[PDB]
Amino acid sequence: TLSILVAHDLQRVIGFENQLPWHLPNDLKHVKKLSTGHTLVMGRKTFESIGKPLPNRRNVVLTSDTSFNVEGVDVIHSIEDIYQLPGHVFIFGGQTLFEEMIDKVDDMYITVIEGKFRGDTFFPPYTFEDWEVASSVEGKLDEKNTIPHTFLHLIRK
Numbered sequence: 001t002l003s004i005l006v007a008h009d010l011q012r013v014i015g016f017e018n019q020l021p022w023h024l025p026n027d028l029k030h031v032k033k034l035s036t037g038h039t040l041v042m043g044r045k046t047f048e049s050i051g052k053p054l055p056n057r058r059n060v061v062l063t064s065d066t067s068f069n070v071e072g073v074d075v076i077h078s079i080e081d082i083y084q085l086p087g088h089v090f091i092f093g094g095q096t097l098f099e100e101m102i103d104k105v106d107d108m109y110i111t112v113i114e115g116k117f118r119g120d121t122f123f124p125p126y127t128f129e130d131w132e133v134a135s136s137v138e139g140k141l142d143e144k145n146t147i148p149h150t151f152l153h154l155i156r157k
């Protein structure tokens with residue numbers, strides 16, 4: 001199964017100055033729950049943002065730089081390489097990988113950040129004519145998670 005995994009805001013912002021503009025440990029816990037024991041595929045910029053591979057899952061970096069290597073990370077150089085990865089594979093970003101994969105994936109796990117933040121990188125537009133909401137769950141708020149957010153699982157219509 002090939003899935004997108006993304007957190008974006010009401011204007012599809014997915015980053016500002018190479019970071020998430022919101023701080024939502026609850027979203028990071030969502031990511032842990034979905035992807036632990038599976039595979040994340042991400043662009044080099046997203047990898048350099050997380051700094052180190054996320055534990056307890058396969059971390060795959062897609063980059064055109066054949067000189068790129070990191071202990072604990074598998075590196076690929078083509079989109080085609082993704083289709084040969086075993087198991088459940090989550091496309092983890094960033095913008096250009098999302099743009100390349102949105103028409104190709106089976107489903108999407110989206111955290112909608114229910115606010116409008118500063119942004120300089122964006123998830124591609126999508127329509128609920130192409131996507132069906134399989135589940136929608138409001139995120140819980142606490143002192144460390146202060147922005148309303150909604151967890152969606154979308155499948156093709």
Ligand SMILES: COc1cc(Cc2cnc(N)nc2N)cc(OC)c1OC
Pocket residue numbers: 005006007014015018019020027028031046049050091092093110111
């Ligand atoms: C684990 O940390 C980060 C994760 C992400 C990607 C990401 C984060 N959340 C969700 N739901 N999907 C994603 N693809 C992006 C980040 O920065 C841009 C991160 O830095 C904290």
